[PDB]
């Protein structure tokens, strides 16, 4: 019943790129020539541990987009393959 | 703050994530440039990791793709990419 | 500076029991006979997520106990795969 944004759909509205689109990009900017697979990982393990456990959208869009420019972020300690694995149990 | 990763293009040029996957297809190799990759990584990471000075740590690795000559406190590849990876 | 109790230490004065040599017996338990495989891991899978989550060791320990008699618990949502790479990145 818990009748609610999905972790998917929190994730394109704090980064306005969509979840699912991120890995198969990551994976095409590893076979590469001047690459910026860095950014991208960063990118998606930021707005994913925002979609996570930021309940505050509008904040949670305001945060990420100050990384935009920073470059600088945190995610609690937790890496992407944590992150990953958390939203993979809603597929 | 800034990531480990993020600060190794800083001062490289270069990107980390790529980089390991550039070491693997040179370990297979031809004329395997293997020596000149490793040290590159071994170094930059290092100073990613302890030199918070990016001005100073740019100039430093630059010295080094000049010289090759280099010094990471006696820590080797592996222990500064197993640090690295603790942030992963 | 970080002055404290690891949480290997934490689950033995929790659970009464040895974190190292409880993989062991997981591992040994499971090739079997009338293996109490499932006893076991649960033992540490709520161990696990006690030491690494519950601070008052008092309360921990209790919390354990009635487990023990009831087999009932909750690690909130954490199996122990997961349990377990959060305490190895303690090593």
Redesign the interface.
Same mark, same amino acid.
């Given at each position: 019943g818990a009748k609610q944004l999905s972790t998917a759909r929190k994730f394109k509205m704090i980064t306005g790129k969509d979840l699912f689109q991120q890995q198969k990009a990551m994976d095409t900017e590893?076979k @590469?020539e001047d690459?910026?697979?860095?950014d991208l990982?960063?990118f998606v393990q930021y707005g994913l541990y925002l979609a996570l456990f930021q309940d505050n959208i509008v904040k949670a869009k305001s945060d990420f987009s100050d990384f935009r420019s920073s470059? $600088?972020?945190d995610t609690d300690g937790k890496?992407? @393959? $944590?992150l990953v $694995?958390l939203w993979q149990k809603e597929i």
């Open positions: 590893l @590469k690459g910026e697979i860095t990982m960063e470059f $600088e972020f890496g992407l @393959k $944590e $694995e």
